[PDB]
Amino acid sequence: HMVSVEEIRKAQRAEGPATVMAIGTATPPNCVDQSTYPDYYFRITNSEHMTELKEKFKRMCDKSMIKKRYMYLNEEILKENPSVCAYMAPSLDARQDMVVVEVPKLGKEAATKAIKEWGQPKSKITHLIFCTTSGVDMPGADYQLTKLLGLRPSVKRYMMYQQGCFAGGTVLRLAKDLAENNKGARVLVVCSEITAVTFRGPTDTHLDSLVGQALFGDGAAAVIVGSDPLPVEKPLFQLVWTAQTILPDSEGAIDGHLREVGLTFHLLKDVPGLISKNIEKALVEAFQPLGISDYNSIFWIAHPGGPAILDQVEAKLGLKPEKMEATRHVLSEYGNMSSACVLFILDQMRKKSIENGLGTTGEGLDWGVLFGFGPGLTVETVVLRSVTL
Amino acid sequence: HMVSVEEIRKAQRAEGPATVMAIGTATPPNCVDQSTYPDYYFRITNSEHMTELKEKFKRMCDKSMIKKRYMYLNEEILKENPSVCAYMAPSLDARQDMVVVEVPKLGKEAATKAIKEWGQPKSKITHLIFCTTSGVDMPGADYQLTKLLGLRPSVKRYMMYQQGCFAGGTVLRLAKDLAENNKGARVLVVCSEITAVTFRGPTDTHLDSLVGQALFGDGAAAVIVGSDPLPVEKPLFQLVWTAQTILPDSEGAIDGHLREVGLTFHLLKDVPGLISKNIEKALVEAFQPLGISDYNSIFWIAHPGGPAILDQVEAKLGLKPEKMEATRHVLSEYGNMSSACVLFILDQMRKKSIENGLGTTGEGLDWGVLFGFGPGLTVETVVLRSVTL
Numbered sequence: 001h002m003v004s005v006e007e008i009r010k011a012q013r014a015e016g017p018a019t020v021m022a023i024g025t026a027t028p029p030n031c032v033d034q035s036t037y038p039d040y041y042f043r044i045t046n047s048e049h050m051t052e053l054k055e056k057f058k059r060m061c062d063k064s065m066i067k068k069r070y071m072y073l074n075e076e077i078l079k080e081n082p083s084v085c086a087y088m089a090p091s092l093d094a095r096q097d098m099v100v101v102e103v104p105k106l107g108k109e110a111a112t113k114a115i116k117e118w119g120q121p122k123s124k125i126t127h128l129i130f131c132t133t134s135g136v137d138m139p140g141a142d143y144q145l146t147k148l149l150g151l152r153p154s155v156k157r158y159m160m161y162q163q164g165c166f167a168g169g170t171v172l173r174l175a176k177d178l179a180e181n182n183k184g185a186r187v188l189v190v191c192s193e194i195t196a197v198t199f200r201g202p203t204d205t206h207l208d209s210l211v212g213q214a215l216f217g218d219g220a221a222a223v224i225v226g227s228d229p230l231p232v233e234k235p236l237f238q239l240v241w242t243a244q245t246i247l248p249d250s251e252g253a254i255d256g257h258l259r260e261v262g263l264t265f266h267l268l269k270d271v272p273g274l275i276s277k278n279i280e281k282a283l284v285e286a287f288q289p290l291g292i293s294d295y296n297s298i299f300w301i302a303h304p305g306g307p308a309i310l311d312q313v314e315a316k317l318g319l320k321p322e323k324m325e326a327t328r329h330v331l332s333e334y335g336n337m338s339s340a341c342v343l344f345i346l347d348q349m350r351k352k353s354i355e356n357g358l359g360t361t362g363e364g365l366d367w368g369v370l371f372g373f374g375p376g377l378t379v380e381t382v383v384l385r386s387v388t389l
Numbered sequence: 390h391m392v393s394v395e396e397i398r399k400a401q402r403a404e405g406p407a408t409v410m411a412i413g414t415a416t417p418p419n420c421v422d423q424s425t426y427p428d429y430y431f432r433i434t435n436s437e438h439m440t441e442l443k444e445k446f447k448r449m450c451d452k453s454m455i456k457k458r459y460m461y462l463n464e465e466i467l468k469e470n471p472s473v474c475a476y477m478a479p480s481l482d483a484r485q486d487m488v489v490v491e492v493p494k495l496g497k498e499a500a501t502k503a504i505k506e507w508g509q510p511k512s513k514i515t516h517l518i519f520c521t522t523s524g525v526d527m528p529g530a531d532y533q534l535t536k537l538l539g540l541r542p543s544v545k546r547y548m549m550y551q552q553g554c555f556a557g558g559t560v561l562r563l564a565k566d567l568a569e570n571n572k573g574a575r576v577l578v579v580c581s582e583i584t585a586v587t588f589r590g591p592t593d594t595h596l597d598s599l600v601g602q603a604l605f606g607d608g609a610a611a612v613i614v615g616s617d618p619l620p621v622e623k624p625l626f627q628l629v630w631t632a633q634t635i636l637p638d639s640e641g642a643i644d645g646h647l648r649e650v651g652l653t654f655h656l657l658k659d660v661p662g663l664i665s666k667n668i669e670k671a672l673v674e675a676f677q678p679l680g681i682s683d684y685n686s687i688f689w690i691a692h693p694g695g696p697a698i699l700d701q702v703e704a705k706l707g708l709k710p711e712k713m714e715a716t717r718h719v720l721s722e723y724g725n726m727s728s729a730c731v732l733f734i735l736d737q738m739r740k741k742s743i744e745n746g747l748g749t750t751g752e753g754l755d756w757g758v759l760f761g762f763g764p765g766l767t768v769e770t771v772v773l774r775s776v777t778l
Contacts, residue, residue: 003679005627005774009406012630013569017394090479092649100646136525136551138645138764146635154634156562161550162525173545180398181570238394241401245543246535256527260482260649285543290392375528385394
């Protein structure tokens with residue numbers, strides 16, 4: 001018998017839908033209260049002179065709906081590196097020396113918890129996705145993490161550098177295909193974010209860049225994705241359908257330039273406006289095909305870029321305040337951790353469902369949506385199936 | 390009737406294997422003779438006074454089996470960005486300013502050609518993979534190309550920044566799954582590499598910097614990949630089987646750091662020695678399941694890191710000197726173009742197959758291998774089926 005390329009293909013493909021089998025999360029040790037961040041931020045940047053600007057920054061932190069955030073940077077590390085406290089001093093190398101080491105360390109912690117939950121030999125991992133918006137190096141963070149966890153050296157790696165806030169959707173859209181087209185494929189997915197690359201002192205001039213100093217926080221999340229679960233693997237959610245789109249009238253809305261001064265952020269245009277004006281379209285393309293029109297009847301995981309996005313979406317669509325609970329909880333407790341955020345929220349949804357003894361991992365509901373938002377302006381959509389408890 | 394995730398997955402997947410349906414390539418316009426380069430390079434870098442070092446470089450360029458390379462950089466641009474011409478000076482904002490605009494323009498040229506060959510409308514592209522090693526930005530080169538080509542806003546992007554030389558394997562490995570798991574999916578892949586980011590002056594202390602300045606050249610390549618070819622599509626090669634592995638005793642062999650002075654390559658260990666020692670393993674892994682042990686009976690595409698790599702691989706396996714023609718031709722005519730190189734070589738192989746009326750797109754042979762080599766030390770393997778000409 002001659003082995004045909006067609007016969008190899010039928011034999012090489014998995015059968016069933018891509019399934020999230022574990023979630024692990026992790027943060028750095030230094031916790032930072034939002035209530036007193038203004039006094040702290042303006043103190044440690046030798047910026048007490050700029051008084052009228054401080055009062056604006058209070059309003060920003062007051063409206064932020066963030067209780068606290070975790071950060072690898074502390075006052076110790078800042079004294080050892082004052083170039084990072086300037087608004088615009090040459091400081092990429094100091095910042096790169098931080099994040100190149102630290103992004104894969106925080107990554108490893110999250111991976112360990114996901115692997116433990118999955119409870120299979122780490123040797124059965126076939127594929128690794130590693131996602132970060134905090135520095136770049138060669139070999140990459142994906143390699144550092146392969147070494148740190150001691151995965152099989154012939155693990156298939158996908159390093160996704162410098163993507164931004166929507167990449168939490170991007171990693172699920174990728175993992176979905178790797179699992180569904182490969183029999184026995186077990187995909188480890190890691191998003192790890194460190195605002196050391198982004199942190200700077202303030203100025204009157206670029207107001208946009210001060211909003212970031214109030215929302216962004218550090219965090220890592222890991223998931224395990226695979227098709228055809230063994231009886232001894234515990235499914236959480238199915239990945240069903242995925243979309244990435246660029247919003248119209250959105251050119252230059254969220255910008256990120258990696259410079260000699262580190263990573264800079266620029267807002268033009270009304271991000272919340274743009275997302276809310278265009279959000280029903282994304283929902284229709286996802287859910288019309290399934291015969292679903294009631295957006296209060298599906299569970300919600302939406303990247304919390306700030307509190308304005310969430311409020312303007314809710315208002316536009318007429319979501320009950322319950323639907324953003326899991327999203328608003330992660331925002332309050334951690335802030336905007338960029339790509340990691342939606343994976344944390346997905347954990348928050350599971351934890352709540354178990355806690356209040358609801359019928360499914362998705363607040364007792366069958367179908368759900370995950371949304372990443374970020375530069376483009378890019379919207380990533382993932383349609384989900386809950387699992388029964 | 391009630392929609393099931395299992396019934397959705399049956400509908401949503403492709404049938405057959407991933408098929409390269411098109412290849413297009415581009416270079417910057419300024420062409421550069423290797424015969425003369427040592428004088429050019431030492432003048433524009435105000436360093437003819439370093440005369441013993443020039444002799445080392447003349448000897449490197451002599452040993453390189455490179456006739457010529459293409460360069461975005463020229464004399465006018467270096468004279469107007471003199472921070473690039475130092476060995477070490479703050480030069481990153483200058484290089485980023487260049488390659489963020491340029492890396493995607495070059496990609497668009499290659500993509501346009503690939504699209505023409507494929508012969509379908511660009512509205513039927515569903516996925517874009519963009520791969521470079523030359524700067525970063527948010528939004529990224531992927532969003533920049535989508536805009537330049539006027540692809541659909543809801544195209545699914547995969548932005549692979551900063552992976553280096555093995556990535557031509559990585560982009561086929563990725564595209565194989567995107568295509569095979571999604572019915573109707575047509576994948577535009579683009580690798581685009583500009584050496585403006587790594588080009589610097591010479592010094593005695595870092596003799597490894599200098600090897601790079603003698604091997605690395607500029608270029609872009611694009612391919613269309615898809616499963617279930619239409620009657621009016623024209624298959625070139627099938628993607629059968631992919632692998633990635635890190636080599637033992639290879640820690641630190643190829644390093645790359647993005648700093649304020651630009652991208653810097655580093656070398657420990659003997660890179661040709663490590664690849665030669667370990668390659669037969671990768672081939673047994675790939676080909677024994679297909680009952681192939683005679684590596685002269687398959688067609689080759691190897692990343693030409695240097696002549697050394699190709700010289701020792703051929704010596705170790707006992708390959709008839711014909712197997713590595715295609716590979717050595719792209720090296721001779723274009724130099725080490727990192728991620729794009731193996732895609733130029735694939736095209737060269739199909740080109741030469743047609744010129745000489747051979748039975749198949751792979752020099753008359755049915756079965757082939759593509760090898761990516763890069764930082765790790767990483768080795769990508771891609772098993773290819775050729776097509777009856």
